[PDB]
């Protein structure tokens, strides 16, 4: 199979502290290379590469276009945030937290939650254990849930109480799930 | 804090163009070009919001006019194929005999064209499958998820088989109850 | 429910 040509348009609406500050970034990308962009913190198009210089020049003479792009911060960005807010920005799905061995390796499995941002901490007898915390990372599933697995390196002994704590916007207080040796 | 992208492309010879909204990297919805309908990523989204798709349909037609013109301005420079990283994960910690989902993460690739088949012990398994459209990346490459619900069992080998113009050959990515 | 909006694609100049 034979040569490909690709054009990409993207309108990015970036939100700071809610809708308080807002910045629109319109981008054109030819064959993976961005070539021109309107940045709303700039107020006009700029060529990102030379390919796009004719386009930056041209669009900057179209008044209706500049003015629309300049107001989009309110007419579009702030608008769409308002429509989707309840079920995007406010979307809460509480993590499911199981803890199981792997001797010498302990697993805090944290799955199905949403928004991404999270903390998992490890506790040995309710005293925090910070050494030998390994983290596979945070996985976006594509379906509006994330998942995490945070490890801890310890060789367990009889008695010892282990505990995983998970802070999350979906719960006012953090989940502690324990595991016993 | 939050980013919302209206993400669009047209692909010159394939004559595919897609349109979709992205919130922090999750599809809110895309427009199906063939049926000219809005297709909500989670069914509930359609109850709390609507999309009238005409504007979207007309952008794709501009995107194509633009491609037509950019193709030429570049003296017909083709795109440099970039092969995807593929990763096979479950939805949750694999529990013997309790329903789970397999996720095929296809990542960091350009031309947004891939052929993806789930294989079970060897045979392609078409039942219960689903997929996402081509989602945006900051680097301008794409992501894309394939799913397969299954009964975790001791017997089964599962491959995610991925085809692309950047790979010398189809990539099989392995999975079996740990 | 409420309409999500769009911003229209800009035409690159005719060659």
């Amino acid at each position, epitope marked *: 199979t034979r040569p490909r040509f690709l054009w990409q348009l993207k309108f990015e609406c970036h939100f700071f502290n809610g809708t308080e500050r807002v910045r629109l970034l319109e981008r054109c990308i030819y064959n993976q290379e961005e070539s021109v962009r309107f940045d709303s913190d700039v107020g006009e198009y700029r060529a990102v590469t030379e390919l796009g210089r004719p386009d930056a020049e041209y669009w900057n003479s179209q008044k*209706d276009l500049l003015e*629309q792009r300049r*107001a989009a911060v309110d*007419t579009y960005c702030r*608008h769409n945030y308002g429509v989707g807010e309840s079920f995007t920005v406010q979307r809460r799905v509480e993590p499911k937290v199981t803890v199981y061995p792997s001797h010498n390796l302990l697993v805090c499995s944290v799955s199905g939650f949403y928004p991404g941002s999270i903390e998992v901490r490890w506790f040995r007898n309710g005293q925090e254990e910070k050494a030998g915390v390994v983290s596979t990372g945070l996985i976006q599933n594509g379906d509006w849930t994330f998942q995490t697995l945070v490890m801890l390196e310890t060789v367990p002994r009889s008695g010892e109480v282990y505990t995983c704590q998970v802070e999350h916007p979906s719960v006012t207080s953090p989940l502690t799930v324990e595991w016993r040796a | 804090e939050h980013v919302i992208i209206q993400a669009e492309f047209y692909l010159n010879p394939d004559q595919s163009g897609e349109f979709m909204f992205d919130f922090d990297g999750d599809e809110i919805f895309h427009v199906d070009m063939a049926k000219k309908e809005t297709v909500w990523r989670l069914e509930e989204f359609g109850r709390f919001a609507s999309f009238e798709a*005409q504007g979207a349909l*007309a952008n794709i037609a*501009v995107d194509k006019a633009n491609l037509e013109i950019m193709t030429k301005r570049s003296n017909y420079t083709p795109i440099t194929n970039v092969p995807p990283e593929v990763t096979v994960l479950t939805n949750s910690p694999v529990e013997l005999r309790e329903p789970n989902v397999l996720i095929c993460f296809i990542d960091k690739f350009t031309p947004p064209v891939v052929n993806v088949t789930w294989l079970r012990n060897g045979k392609p398994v078409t039942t219960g499958v689903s997929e996402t459209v081509f989602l945006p990346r900051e680097d301008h490459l794409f992501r894309k998820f394939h799913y397969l619900p299954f009964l975790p069992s001791t017997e089964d080998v599962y491959d995610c088989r991925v085809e692309h113009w950047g790979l010398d050959e189809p990539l099989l990515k392995h999975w079996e109850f740990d | 429910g409420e*309409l999500i909006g769009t911003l*229209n694609a800009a035409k690159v100049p005719a060659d």
Partner: T-cell receptor
Amino acid sequence: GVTQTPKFRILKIGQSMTLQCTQDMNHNYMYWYRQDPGMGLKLIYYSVGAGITDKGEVPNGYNVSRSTTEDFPLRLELAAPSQTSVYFCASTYHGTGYFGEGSWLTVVE
Amino acid sequence: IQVEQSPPDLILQEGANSTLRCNFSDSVNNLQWFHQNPWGQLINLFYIPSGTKQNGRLSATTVATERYSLLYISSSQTTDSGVYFCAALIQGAQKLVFGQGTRLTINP
């Protein structure tokens, strides 16, 4: 700007007719409106680009096609008195809307 | 969806200042002002999706946040008579869409 023809036309009942509408501005979006004496502009039909047409509030009795960006012909299949109106065509894309000079049409018994 | 225009009717003496109100629902934006004249002719006065814009004796403000636009006419002239239409663009469908308008009459 936008230019539209018949500025004026007298049509008999049952006759057909075409109102042309053209625009050299490259606007992708075009609309036909109607207006009844001292009333509001109601929408007959509209188009956001070549090969895309969509009904308005009052589309019944009119057809429309848009094979090019430039032209947006309105076509009255069969004249009924109810179609005595002033018709208006428009174009925008990114901002300012632009109107044709008007079509005054009376359908007669 | 829609576009609510306030005073349907206004009669004022020349040289007076007149304020026109157009309230728009969430379903539309990217506001505009038109003047028909008593012979059916229509011109744009402003494309004014947000902020203040001014052209001679005319000025317009739109607060996109708060869903209203306002056409101001200082020192009204008899010639400004006619109908003032406000119009917006439905989000998504780019259906341009017109309110009932304000018959303005400026007496000598």
